[PDB]
Design a protein around this ligand. Structure first.
Ligand code: CLA
Ligand SMILES: CCCCCCCCCCCCCCCCCC(=O)OC[C@H](CO[C@@H]1O[C@H](CO)[C@H](O)[C@H](O)[C@H]1O)OC(=O)CCCCCCCCCCCCCCCCC
Ligand code: HEC
Ligand SMILES: CC1=C(/C=C/C(C)=C/C=C/C(C)=C/C=C/C=C(C)/C=C/C=C(C)/C=C/C2=C(C)CCCC2(C)C)C(C)(C)CCC1
Ligand SMILES: CCCCCCCCCCCCO[C@@H]1O[C@H](CO)[C@@H](O[C@H]2O[C@H](CO)[C@@H](O)[C@H](O)[C@H]2O)[C@H](O)[C@H]1O
Ligand SMILES: CCCCCCCS[C@@H]1O[C@H](CO)[C@@H](O)[C@H](O)[C@H]1O
Ligand SMILES: CCCCCCCS[C@@H]1O[C@H](CO)[C@@H](O)[C@H](O)[C@H]1O
Ligand SMILES: CCCCCCCS[C@@H]1O[C@H](CO)[C@@H](O)[C@H](O)[C@H]1O
Ligand SMILES: [Ca+2]
Ligand SMILES: [Cl-]
Lengths: 137, 56, 97, 245, 56
C-alpha cells in the first residue's frame, strides 16, 4: 500500500469540490497537528472532551459542516461548539485566540490547509483507529 | 461450647475491645482487661515463662 | 422476580432511539444541531409525556423548535429509570472513549 | 470573630462543622408573605449515628444503638440552597434545589459489623407549622427526602458484576447453577424515602440566620440488592441563612 | 455431528428428527467440560466434582 494521490484527495468545500494534497503538504500538516493539536487530539480523539472526536463522520454532522478543508480552516480561525451556537476561541486554539494560544501565531493559510488535510487523510489510512481511542491501539 | 469465657466473666471480665459485653450492653469500654487483653496477657506470660525456663 | 432494569430497558425504545427521559447527554451528538445547547435544555427539562412535549421547553428559539421537529423521529420517551438518572449520570455516565 | 480563611481552617476539623450562633440569638425573623424567600445555605452536621438492632423476636422493642464512625470528618451536608415558600396557611416550605446534600458514611456496631449509609437530604421538602409570621425558637421544619442507592449503577462488585456495567454471572463458577446466585448476580437499585425534623434553637432576627438540632431517619446501604438495609437515625446540629429572594 | 445432521436433512428428516438422531454420547464429546485442557492443578478429583454428573 502507498500514500497515493487518491488517498490524498479530500473535499475542499461542501459543494463537491476536492483538492489533491501533495505528500509534502500531508507531512507538514502532520507535523503541525503534532506541534499545535496533539496534546489534546492525539490519534483523533479529544482528551479534554472525549465526547467529540475528529472522525470524518463526526465532522460532517458538525454545524457548520467541518468535513472539508474550508470548514476545518474556518474552525482553526473561529472555533464553535458542535451546534455552531457559541464561539469558543477563548478556550480553544485558533488564529483569533493566538494571543492566548501562542502556538497559533504565524500559522499561515497554507499551514491551516495542511493541518485540515491531515485531519481528513488520517482516517482514510487508519480507519477506526482515528478517533477510536485505546480500544483500537 | 464456651469453656474459658465463663471463668473470665465470673471474676469481672465481661467486655470486648470490639464494644460488646456478655450482658448484652453496647458501646462499652472495658479498658485493657477485656477478654482480648486477658488472652494477650496470658500469651505474653507464656513467652516470659518460656524464656525463664531456658535460663534455669 | 429479579431483573436487571438496564438490560430490560434495552428491549424498549430506549434501545432504539434517544430517550429524552433517560439517555445520557452525549447521545445528542449523533445528529446535527442538538449538542450542546439543545442537549442541555432537554436533559434539564425532562421528563416528557411524549416526544413532542420537547417542543414546549421554556425559552426555546424559533430555530431550535425547527431543529427539534426535524429530530423527533430519532427520539423516544420511556418511564424514568432511577438507575440511569441518579448520580448525575445523564451528564456523565463514566464512559469516555 | 476573626473571619477564618482556608489556611486558618485547613486540617483542624472545622471544615466539617456547621456555623453556630451564640446565646444572644433568641430573636424572631419576620416573614413578609408578599415577599419570596430562599435558604442561601443549609448545613447539617451529624453528631451521632444510631442503627436499629435487628432482634430475633419479632415482636419485641428493637432499639437504636450507638455506633462508631470510622470514615472521619467527612460526614456533613452543606452549601445546600433552595426556595423557601410562604404558604396560604402561613407555614413555610423549604424546597431543596442543590448543594452538597449527601455523604457516604460508615459506622461500626459493637462486634465489628460495618454499616455504610448514604447520609442525605436529597430533594428535601420540609415545612413548618401554620402561621409562622416570624421564625423563632418555636419554629420547626419536618419533611421527607429521597435516598438513592449508596452505590450508583456503574459500581462493580469484587467479581466484576454490576447493573449498568459488568458481568451478569459468576464467571469463576462457570457450571454452577445460577438460581442460588441470582440475588448476587442481578444488581438492583434502591430508592427509598427518609424523614427529618429540624428544631430551631437559635435565631438572629437581624441577619436571618437560624440554628438548631436535627434528627433524620433513613435506610442504610443494601449493596445493590444483595442484603437488607438497616434503619438509621442521625442526630446533629444545623445552620441555615434565610434571605429574601 | 453437522455431517450426520446434514445427511439426515438431505434424506428428508425434519430438523427435530435430524438432531434427535444424534447420539447423546457423540454430543457429549462436543462439550468443553470433557476437554482435558480445562482443569487446574489443585482442582482435585473426578470431572463430576466440577460441572456435575451429566444426566442428559
Ligand atoms: C501417576 C500417578 C497418578 C495419577 C496420574 C493419578 C490420577 C488420578 N487419581 Mg490417583 N493415586 C495415585 C497416583 C496417581 N493418580 C497414588 C500414588 C495414590 C495413593 C496416594 C492415588 C490415590 C488416589 C485417590 C484416593 C483418588 C485419586 C484420584 C485420581 C484422579 C484425581 C487426581 C487429582 O485430583 O490429583 C490432584 C493432584 C495434585 C493436587 C498435585 C499434587 C502436587 C504435589 C503435592 C507436589 C509436591 C511438591 C513437593 C512437595 C516439592 C518438593 C520441593 C523440594 C525438592 C525442594 C486422577 C484420575 C481421585 C479420584 O477421583 O478417584 C476416583 C481420588 O479420590 N487417586
Ligand atoms: C507415608 C504417607 C504419605 C503421607 C501423605 C502426605 C499427604 C500430603 C501430600 C498430599 C497433597 C496432595 C493432595 C492434594 C489435596 C488433596 O486432597 O487430594 C485429594 C485427591 C482426591 O480428590 C478428591 O476426590 C474426591 C472423590 O474421590 C472428591 O471429588 C474430593 O472433592 C476431591 O478433593 O487425592 C488424589 O487425587 C491423590 C492422587 C494425586 C495424583 C498426583 C499426580 C502426580 C503428581 C506429581 C507431583 C510431582 C511433584 C514433583 C515435585 C518435586
Ligand atoms: C486541548 C486544550 C485542545 C487543543 C490543544 C486543541 N483542541 Fe480541538 N478541541 C478541543 C475540545 C475540548 C474540543 C471540543 C470543543 C467543543 O466544546 O465543541 C475540540 C474540538 C475540535 C474540533 C471539532 C471536532 C468536531 O467533531 O466537531 C476540531 C476540528 C478541532 N478541535 C481541531 C483542532 C485543531 C486543528 C487543533 C490544533 C490547531 C486543536 N483542535 C487543538 C480541545 C483542544
Ligand atoms: C505486677 C503486676 C502484674 C503481674 C505481673 C507478672 C505476672 C509478672 C511476670 C513476670 C515474669 C514472668 C517475668 C519473666 C522474666 C524472664 C526473663 C527476664 C528471662 C530471661 C531469659 C534469659 C536472659 C535467657 C537467656 C538464654 C536463652 C534465651 C537461650 C539459652 C541461652 C540463655 C540461657 C543465655 C499484673 C499484670 C497482674 C497487674 C499489674 C501489676
Ligand atoms: C409532568 C412532567 C411530565 C411527566 C413525564 C413522565 C412520564 C414518563 C413518559 C411516558 C412514556 C410512556 O411509557 C413508555 O412507553 C414506551 C412505548 O410504549 C415503552 O417502550 C416500549 O418501546 C418499544 C418500541 O420499539 C417496545 O419494543 C417495548 O416492548 C416497550 O417497553 C416504555 O417501556 C414505557 O416506559
Ligand atoms: C500490651 C500493651 C498494653 C496496651 C495498654 C492500653 C491501655 S488502655 C487503658 O487500660 C486501663 C487499665 O484498666 C483502663 O483503666 C483505661 O480505661 C484504658 O484506656
Ligand atoms: C500487642 C499490641 C496490641 C494491643 C492493643 C491494645 C488495645 S487497647 C484498648 O483499645 C480499645 C479500642 O478498641 C478500648 O476499648 C480499650 O479501652 C483499650 O485499652
Ligand atoms: C491479642 C488479641 C488481638 C486481636 C484482637 C482482635 C480484635 S477484638 C475482636 O474484634 C472483632 C471485630 O470487631 C469482634 O467480632 C470480636 O468479638 C472481638 O474479639
Ligand atoms: Ca426550639
Ligand atoms: Cl462515537
Amino acid at each position: 500500500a502507498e500514500l497515493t494521490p487518491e488517498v490524498l484527495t479530500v473535499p475542499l468545500n461542501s459543494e463537491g469540490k476536492t483538492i489533491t494534497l501533495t505528500e509534502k503538504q500531508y507531512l507538514e500538516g502532520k507535523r503541525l497537528f503534532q506541534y499545535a493539536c496533539a496534546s489534546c487530539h492525539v490519534g483523533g480523539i479529544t482528551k479534554t472532551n472525549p465526547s467529540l472526536d475528529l472522525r470524518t463522520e463526526t465532522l460532517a454532522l458538525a454545524t457548520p459542516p467541518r468535513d472539508n478543508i474550508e470548514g476545518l480552516v474556518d474552525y482553526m480561525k473561529n472555533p464553535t461548539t458542535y451546534d455552531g451556537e457559541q464561539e469558543i476561541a477563548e478556550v480553544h486554539p485558533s488564529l483569533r485566540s493566538a494571543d492566548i494560544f501562542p502556538k497559533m501565531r504565524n500559522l499561515t493559510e497554507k499551514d491551516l490547509v495542511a493541518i485540515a488535510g491531515h485531519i481528513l487523510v488520517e482516517p482514510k489510512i487508519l480507519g477506526d483507529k482515528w478517533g477510536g481511542g485505546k480500544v483500537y491501539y | 461450647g464456651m469453656f474459658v469465657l465463663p471463668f473470665m466473666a465470673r471474676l469481672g471480665v465481661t467486655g470486648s475491645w470490639s464494644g460488646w459485653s456478655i450482658t448484652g450492653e453496647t458501646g462499652i469500654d472495658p479498658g485493657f482487661w477485656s477478654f482480648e487483653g486477658v488472652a494477650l496477657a496470658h500469651i505474653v506470660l507464656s513467652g516470659l515463662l518460656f524464656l525463664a525456663a531456658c535460663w534455669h | 422476580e429479579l431483573v436487571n432494569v438496564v438490560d430490560e430497558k434495552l428491549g424498549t425504545a430506549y434501545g432504539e432511539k434517544i430517550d429524552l427521559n433517560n439517555t445520557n447527554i452525549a447521545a445528542f451528538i449523533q445528529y446535527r444541531g442538538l449538542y450542546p445547547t439543545l442537549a442541555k435544555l432537554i436533559v434539564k427539562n425532562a421528563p416528557y409525556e411524549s416526544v413532542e412535549d420537547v417542543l414546549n421547553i421554556p425559552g426555546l428559539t424559533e430555530r431550535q423548535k425547527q431543529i427539534l421537529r426535524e429530530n423527533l423521529e430519532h427520539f423516544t420517551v420511556t418511564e424514568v429509570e432511577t438507575a440511569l438518572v441518579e448520580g448525575g449520570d445523564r451528564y456523565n455516565n463514566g464512559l469516555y472513549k | 470573630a476573626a473571619t477564618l480563611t482556608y489556611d486558618d481552617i485547613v486540617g483542624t476539623g472545622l471544615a466539617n462543622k456547621c456555623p453556630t450562633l451564640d446565646d444572644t440569638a433568641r430573636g424572631a425573623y419576620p416573614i413578609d408573605s408578599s415577599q419570596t424567600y430562599r435558604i442561601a445555605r443549609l448545613c447539617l452536621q451529624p453528631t451521632t449515628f444510631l442503627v436499629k438492632e435487628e432482634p430475633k423476636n419479632k415482636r419485641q422493642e428493637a432499639e437504636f444503638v450507638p455506633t462508631k464512625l470510622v470514615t472521619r470528618e467527612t460526614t456533613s451536608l452543606d452549601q445546600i440552597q433552595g426556595e423557601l415558600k410562604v404558604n396560604s396557611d402561613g407555614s413555610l416550605t423549604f424546597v431543596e434545589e442543590d448543594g452538597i446534600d449527601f455523604q457516604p458514611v460508615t459506622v461500626q456496631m459493637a462486634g465489628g459489623e460495618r454499616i455504610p449509609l448514604l447520609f442525605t437530604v436529597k430533594n428535601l421538602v420540609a415545612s413548618t407549622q401554620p402561621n409562622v409570621t416570624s421564625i423563632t425558637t418555636s419554629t420547626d421544619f419536618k419533611g421527607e427526602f429521597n435516598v438513592p442507592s449508596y452505590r450508583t449503577a456503574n459500581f462493580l462488585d469484587p467479581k466484576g458484576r454490576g447493573l449498568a456495567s459488568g458481568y451478569d454471572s459468576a464467571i469463576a463458577l462457570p457450571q454452577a447453577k445460577e438460581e442460588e446466585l441470582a440475588r448476587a448476580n442481578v444488581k438492583r437499585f434502591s430508592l427509598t424515602k427518609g424523614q427529618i425534623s429540624l428544631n430551631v434553637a437559635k435565631v438572629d432576627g437581624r441577619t436571618g440566620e437560624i440554628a438548631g438540632t436535627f434528627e433524620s431517619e433513613q435506610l442504610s446501604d443494601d449493596d445493590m440488592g444483595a442484603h437488607e438495609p438497616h434503619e438509621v437515625k442521625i442526630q446533629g446540629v444545623f445552620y441555615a441563612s434565610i434571605e429574601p429572594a | 455431528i453437522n455431517r450426520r445432521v446434514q445427511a439426515s436433512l438431505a434424506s428428508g428428516a425434519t430438523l427435530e428428527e435430524a438432531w434427535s438422531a444424534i447420539p447423546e454420547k457423540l454430543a457429549f464429546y462436543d462439550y468443553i467440560g470433557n476437554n482435558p485442557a480445562k482443569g487446574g492443578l489443585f482442582r482435585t478429583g473426578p470431572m463430576n466434582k466440577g460441572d456435575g454428573i451429566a444426566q442428559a
